Amino acid sequence: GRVIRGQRKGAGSVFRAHVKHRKGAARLRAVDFAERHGYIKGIVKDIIHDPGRGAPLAKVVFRDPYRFKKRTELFIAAEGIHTGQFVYCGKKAQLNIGNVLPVGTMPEGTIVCCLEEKPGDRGKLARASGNYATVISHNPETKKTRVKLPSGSKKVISSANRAVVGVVAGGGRIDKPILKAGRAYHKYKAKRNCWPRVRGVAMNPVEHPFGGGNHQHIGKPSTIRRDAPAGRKVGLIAARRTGRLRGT
Amino acid sequence: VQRLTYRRRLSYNTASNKTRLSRTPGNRIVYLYTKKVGKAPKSACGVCPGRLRGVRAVRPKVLMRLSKTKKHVSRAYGGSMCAKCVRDRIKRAFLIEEQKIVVKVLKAQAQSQK
Amino acid sequence: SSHKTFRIKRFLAKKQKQNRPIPQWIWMKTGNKIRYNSKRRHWRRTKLGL
């Protein structure tokens, strides 16, 4: 049969991301002597809107400790950050909103965002709009810290990785209903060619394993095993249960 | 009414293909291809929405032609920053430097008794 | 178009010069078989490729 739509996305060249008007890779400042043994001070110049992203970005300017230069970084803006505000970075930095420091310094129950899953990778966890992570517990021997990720799954990270304090700005974004197809078109035109989703039951059997028949119906269990070949692995992949969520 | 045509091969109404009407010594109406409107410099402070005064608003390669007095204001940070954010930075640079002297004095005041 | 390149204009120049009839004196020759120019081209009929 024909190669299916979900298979065709990995080749690229149509389904690639629309990154023309994006402002850059939003990440934390790289770790150095100042941010490892003390703190460095920077200033929030402006807060910009990144296309295809509900979170706003903050352009923070530091000064280089080794060269007479001003360094520009794009942080993900914690909610409450304004311009002219000084953002501090490092182990000895105090605990305020918009102030990145390692998670082993802050107490238990601290609300963070732009958390690092590995030490020094400039922020990977809890960085979508309105999302945050919570510090559960520490472990001073072997340098480990337990955090609660925004999916609820708890992760043990190293004690030396960095996270900026606060929630991500732009929360409640999924609260407003998209009223019409046009706003969804404009939303996904800024991200990628994925939006006008045709159901597999509306297709032909050459096009999808769900297509065909004189009635629009699946005709086979939509729950599929994890180790299924591509072109077959559609529907509900590796599903433990498939029903209306009652209880927990 | 004399309808008029373009004088160049670009037949599309783009941003560079902008014209204006002109009356001629031969008593006829011609197109004159205008230049783009210039902009005065924005202040280096980054907060003032207005543009700077005393500097002519021209295209960037016209600033080669102009003399220096047409391009700046006789002041510190003149032609690059507005006077409000110059004096508000003079006050800031003076006052934080004064407060550092106060902190240095109060450090030795504590170390004298202790 | 009027926005030609040098190589295209030179190719058009050669194909302009090959589009003339045969001289009258060539078929008074002894070993001659040519009656006319059979490689002729009209701008409306044959569109020269390109």
Binding site: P56, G80, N96, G130, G172, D175 | - | -
Partner: protein, 91 residues
């Protein structure tokens, strides 16, 4: 006079999208377009620019806030928790 009896902002949507969806989006479309007071200059000129971005017309101060409101109750409580934990750590 009073133009509409129960629809406000969502009267522009006419007779479409469902009454309950219009009633849902009415709160967002009021709070999104309302002009808030500024915490820096005191003027009521804090207006939304994009999601998370709220700009003051007089002070030229832009703040990272919520998507449809200037402040979110999910972050005010976080601000309180961070100041109490900051006081707890330093004692």
């Amino acid at each position: 006079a009073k133009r509409t009896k129960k629809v406000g902002i969502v009267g522009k949507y006419g007779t479409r999208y469902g009454a309950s969806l219009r009633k849902m989006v009415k709160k967002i479309e009021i709070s999104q377009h309302a002009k808030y007071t500024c915490s820096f200059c005191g003027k009521t000129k804090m207006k939304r620019r994009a999601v998370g971005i709220w700009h003051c017309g007089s002070c030229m101060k832009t703040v990272a806030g919520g998507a449809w409101t200037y402040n979110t109750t999910s972050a005010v409580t976080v601000k309180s928790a961070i100041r109490r934990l900051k006081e707890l750590k330093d004692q």
